[PDB]
From a paper:
Here, we use a panel of human monoclonal antibodies with neutralizing activity to long-chain α-neurotoxins (LNTxs) to investigate pH-dependent antigen binding. To establish the molecular basis for pH-dependent antigen binding in these antibodies, we determined at five different pHs the crystal structures of two neutralizing antibodies (A01 and [name]) with different pH-dependent binding affinities to LNTxs from the elapids Naja kaouthia and [name]. Collectively, these results provide a basis for the neutralization of LNTxs by the A01 and [name] mAbs by receptor mimicry, thereby inhibiting toxin interactions with the nAChR through the heavy-chain CDR-H3 loop.
We also sought to crystallize and determine the structure of [name] in complex with α-bungarotoxin for comparative analysis because it displays less pH-dependent antigen binding as compared to A01, and also because it is known to neutralize several LNTxs, including α-bungarotoxin from the elapid [name], both in vivo and in vitro. Due to the known reactivity of the [name] mAb to α-bungarotoxin and the moderate sequence identity (SI) between α-bungarotoxin and α-cobratoxin (60% SI), we selected α-bungarotoxin for further crystallization trials at pH 6.5 and pH 7.5 with the [name] scFv. The total buried interface surface areas of both scFvs bound to their respective LNTx were 923.6 Å2 and 963.4 Å2 for the A01 and [name] antibody-toxin complexes, respectively, according to a Proteins, Interfaces, Structures, and Assemblies (PISA) interaction analysis. The differences in the interaction surface areas are attributed mainly to the light chains, with the [name] light-chain having a larger interaction surface area than the A01 light-chain. Finally, a structural alignment of α-bungarotoxin bound to the [name] mAb and to its target receptor, the muscle-type nicotinic acetylcholine receptor (nAChR) isolated from Pacific electric ray (Tetronarce californica) revealed an equivalent network of hydrogen bonds and cation–π interactions between the CDR-H3 loop and the loop C in the nAChR, mimicking the interaction with α-bungarotoxin. Particularly conspicuous interactions are Tyr99CDR-H3, Tyr100iCDR-H3, and Cys100e (backbone carbonyl), which occupy similar hydrogen bonding networks as loop C residues from nAChR Tyr189, Tyr190, and Tyr189, respectively. By contrast, [name] forms a hydrogen bond with the backbone carbonyl of Ser34 on finger II of α-bungarotoxin through the side chain of Arg93CDR-L3. By contrast, His34CDR-L1 in [name] participates in additional interdomain interactions that may contribute to a more stabilized paratope and heavy-light-chain interface at both pH values. The interdomain (chain interface) interactions in [name] are stabilized by hydrogen bonds and hydrophobic interactions between CDR-H3 tyrosine residues Tyr100jCDR-H3, Tyr100lCDR-H3, and Tyr100mCDR-H3 and light-chain residues Asp31CDR-L1, Tyr49FWR-2, and Glu50CDR-L2 in the neighboring protein environment of His34CDR-L1.
Author numbering:
A (entry chain C): 145 to 263
B (entry chain X): 1 to 73
C (entry chain B): 1 to 133
The structure:
């Protein structure tokens, strides 16, 4: 009766110009059985789509954003290359549970851009 | 005959024009078949529509006999 | 470039109901579905259900079945979410959001419900519910 879960890391952090990857793991059923989409949500704003249909980019979304699927880990991933301060936001994956006929959202990942340089 | 039609908003039932005494359902897959299921066209016909490869067409001759799957018992 | 414009924030007593509206620009819902998605404070997005006006059917998440009602009036291009028996867990921002993939075109329609990605989002409506109940 429970929907499958989409589990994302709660927090991801990186310096500008680096590449970050945010995963979304499906707890039951195959990740490839249903499309995964990704939304960006800035504070005080509504979500907007950054990736749809696993790896498609809406018009207007920079090419630094890409999506992929990894069957062996049963996960989807959002990759952001050339990270910019403006990419600081919450990111949600989303799919669909055909058994219960419900949209499933991941729990969200807060992306923070580090200000100092660490090694 | 009254038939369901997918040509109206919302989808609805209509009395068929003179000489069209059959309801029909025509179905085919598009690229979203694996998620949204088949595309379905419902309406009226004089003769049961011809079908191309990979299309399914079935007709019936009682009122409202061709409901959309989401409006069918 | 449709927009969805929602009604304003509300503060409610426990046990009351709220009805949030969602007006589509352009005068029509066409064959699109509209979902309602909520976000409790500091928490994630949660789907409540949706409506497909062209079919006259609504779909609900089991968590809200029988307590929420989602409706839409094509004639006024407005969709609504009525949530009853409000409690503290219902304090949240409520969003309406359009499913990008229409259900019909050229006089034919898809057979099955499947909620695709949400392209156009309303601005959100905060509903705050006071304690108890």
């Amino acid at each position: 009766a429970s929907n499958f879960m989409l589990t994302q890391p709660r927090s991801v952090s990186e310096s500008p110009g680096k590449t970050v990857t945010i995963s979304c793991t499906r707890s039951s059923g195959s990740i490839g059985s249903d499309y995964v989409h990704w939304y960006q949500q800035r504070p005080g704003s509504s979500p907007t789509t950054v990736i749809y249909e696993d790896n498609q980019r809406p018009s207007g979304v920079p090419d630094r954003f890409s999506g992929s699927i990894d069957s062996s880990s049963n996960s989807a991933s959002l990759t952001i290359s050339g990270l910019k301060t403006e990419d600081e936001a919450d990111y949600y994956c989303q799919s669909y549970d055909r058994s219960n006929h419900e949209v499933v959202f991941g729990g969200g990942t807060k992306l923070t851009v580090l200000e100092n340089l660490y090694f | 005959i009254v038939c369901h039609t997918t040509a109206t908003s919302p989808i609805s039932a209509v009395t068929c024009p003179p000489g069209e005494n059959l309801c029909y359902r025509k179905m085919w897959c598009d690229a979203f078949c694996s998620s949204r299921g088949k595309v379905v066209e419902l309406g009226c016909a004089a003769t049961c529509p011809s079908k191309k490869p990979y299309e399914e067409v079935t007709c019936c001759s009682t009122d409202k006999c061709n409901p959309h799957p989401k409006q069918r018992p | 470039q449709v927009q969805l414009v929602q009604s304003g924030a509300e503060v409610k007593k426990p046990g009351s109901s709220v009805k949030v509206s969602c007006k589509a620009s352009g005068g029509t819902f066409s064959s699109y579905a509209i979902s309602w998605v909520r976000q409790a404070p500091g928490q994630g997005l949660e789907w409540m259900g949706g409506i497909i006006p062209i079919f006259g059917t609504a779909n609900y998440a089991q968590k809200f079945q029988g307590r929420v009602t989602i409706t839409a009036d094509e004639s006024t291009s407005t969709a609504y979410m009525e949530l009853r028996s409000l409690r503290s867990d219902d304090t949240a921002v409520y969003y309406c959001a359009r499913d990008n993939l229409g259900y019909c075109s050229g006089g034919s329609c898809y057979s099955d419900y499947y909620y695709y990605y949400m392209d156009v989002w309303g601005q959100g409506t905060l509903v705050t519910v006071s304690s108890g109940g």
